[PDB]
Design a protein around this nucleic acid. Structure first.
Ligand SMILES: [Mg+2]
Ligand SMILES: [Mg+2]
Length: 491
DNA sequence: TGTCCCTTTATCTCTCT
DNA sequence: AGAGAGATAAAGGGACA
């Protein structure tokens, strides 16, 4: 018969038991493990469902799924059971960091490499464990750690980079390649092209950093001499992964989009300057004559939607959802363009289409309140979080729907909301902050870490903030979040 | 195939003023 | 708040054994 039958049945036999305790996996979770981790991962999750969730380890089910769902997932699962207590006691890592290191293709290699190299990277190269964790927490982590161990001295001394810059380069998939390409090309790009080290670091500091570096070296001259692009614009384009693809595409499409479609070089650069920029550029070439037709959307609007990561996905979702959202849900194209014009534009739009009636009917929000929550990066996360937490924040903590909406209406709205649910009790009950002040701190980008910093300072007080009253901490948190507090801590 | 590494795309969260 | 920066995830190919 068909080969993969004996495998698929073996997959389904086991996945039946995983559905209940201890792990209680949902079809969705089982698909994810099967897809990436494969069949070996699913059988392992089962083989050891007790060892990981029980004791010592006490992994959550989601942490188990996180580690299992990668090529080699079984190897990682086995390695985690052996190395988690060692890394957590010998090197002072938290279980969550260990999990985070494990949760990538080659997790075992990364974990074993952290075990081996973390003391030498910290003592001989003066890196922090945080920094070693961040480098390890990508595919090929092992390669990036060994390459950092090998190239830190030459990069800092012969090339002038700071160790923070080296970590930033190493801290992506393909970190090793980025590191070596920076070693080779840094003088070429600085001397032959007038680039600063900082700009080169920005180009090298994404996935496929190597490809972007080589492609800036190759395409910067054409792009600057022949199309009159400045080196700032080429760097902006290249500093986002898929960089190479975006640069190669801009070379072709810049004159086309400018001549045949009436865009400025400036607008093309903006569309190109995002993850998957090549896809955005191409979708705009295709869809500008269509979306801007029947006196419909303006080019400016089309460009705005395109000028975010996943601009392609956002543009296509606009094309498909604009009529049903306007007609059946009462929205304007203005509002629709607004939802689409952030990273995750597609997700936000589909979640609006799905949740607007429930948010209004069951929760008594206005369509405008839904549009505002939706109109930030992470819109979908915020909307789904508002659906779950609006009733519990109002009834358990006395918050008004308005206040919930204000917390939700920012990037990271979901994190801010969950953090308000968590910390409002201690902030108010135990430290006498008014609910209004918690709301105020939470109603900004960076809401979550702002609240966590406030709690950190009140629960385990640092005398470097002694001369600051609660009212003053609060004003600082509102004004500048965690960064403000942390700076104040440095005084 | 199982595992490890790399690149590209999309999505989500926080920073800096 | 808007631009910029900083993370995290998903899926696919190349490689090798
Ligand atoms: Mg970026
Ligand atoms: Mg594969």
């Amino acid at each position: 018969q068909w080969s993969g039958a004996r495998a698929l049945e073996a997959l389904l036999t086991v996945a039946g038991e995983l559905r209940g305790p201890p792990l209680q996996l949902d079809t969705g979770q089982l698909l994810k493990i099967a897809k990436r981790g494969g069949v070996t991962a699913v059988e392992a999750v089962h083989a050891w469902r007790n060892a990981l969730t029980g004791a010592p380890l006490n992994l959550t089910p989601e942490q188990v799924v996180a580690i299992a769902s990668h090529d080699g997932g079984k190897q990682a699962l086995e390695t985690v059971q052996r190395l988690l207590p060692v890394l957590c006691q010998a090197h002072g890592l938290t279980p969550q960091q260990v999990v985070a290191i494990a949760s990538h293709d080659g997790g075992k290699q990364a974990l074993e490499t952290v075990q081996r190299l973390l003391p030498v990277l910290c003592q001989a190269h003066g890196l922090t464990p945080e920094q070693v964790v961040a480098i390890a927490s990508h595919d090929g982590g092992k390669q990036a750690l060994e390459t950092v161990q090998a190239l830190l001295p030459v990069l800092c001394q012969a090339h002038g980079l700071t160790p923070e810059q080296v970590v930033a380069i190493a801290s992506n998939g393909g970190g090793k390649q980025a590191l070596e390409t920076v070693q080779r090309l840094l003088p070429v790009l600085c001397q032959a092209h007038g680039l600063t080290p900082q700009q080169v670091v920005a180009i090298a500091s994404n996935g496929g950093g190597k490809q972007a570096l080589e492609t800036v070296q190759r395409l910067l001259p054409v792009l600057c001499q022949a199309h009159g692009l400045t080196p700032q614009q080429v760097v902006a384009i290249a500093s986002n992964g898929g960089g190479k693809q975006a640069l190669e595409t801009v070379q072709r499409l810049l004159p086309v989009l400018c001549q045949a479609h009436g865009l400025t070089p400036q607008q093309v650069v903006a569309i190109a300057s995002n993850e998957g920029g090549k896809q955005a550029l191409e979708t705009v070439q295709r869809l500008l004559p269509v979306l801007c037709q029947a006196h419909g959307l303006t080019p400016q609007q089309v460009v705005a939607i395109a000028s975010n990561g996943g601009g392609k996905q956002a543009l296509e979702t606009v094309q498909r959802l604009l009529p049903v959202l306007c007609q059946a849900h009462g929205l304007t194209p203005q509002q629709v363009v607004a939802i689409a014009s952030h990273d995750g534009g597609k997700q936000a739009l589909e979640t609006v289409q799905r949740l607007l009636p429930v948010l209004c009917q069951a929760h008594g929000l206005t369509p405008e309140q839904v549009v505002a929550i939706a109109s930030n990066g992470g819109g979908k996360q915020a909307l789904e979080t508002v659906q779950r937490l609006l009733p519990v924040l109002c009834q358990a903590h006395g918050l008004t729907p308005e206040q919930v909406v204000a917390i939700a209406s920012h990037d990271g709205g979901k994190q801010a909301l969950e953090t308000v649910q968590r910390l409002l009790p201690v902030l108010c009950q135990a430290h006498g902050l008014t609910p209004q002040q918690v709301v105020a701190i939470a109603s900004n980008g960076g809401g979550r870490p702002a609240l966590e910093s406030i709690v950190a300072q009140l629960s385990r007080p640092d005398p470097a903030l002694a001369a600051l009253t609660n009212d003053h901490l609060v004003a600082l948190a509102c004004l500048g979040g965690r960064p403000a507090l942390d700076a104040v801590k440095k005084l």
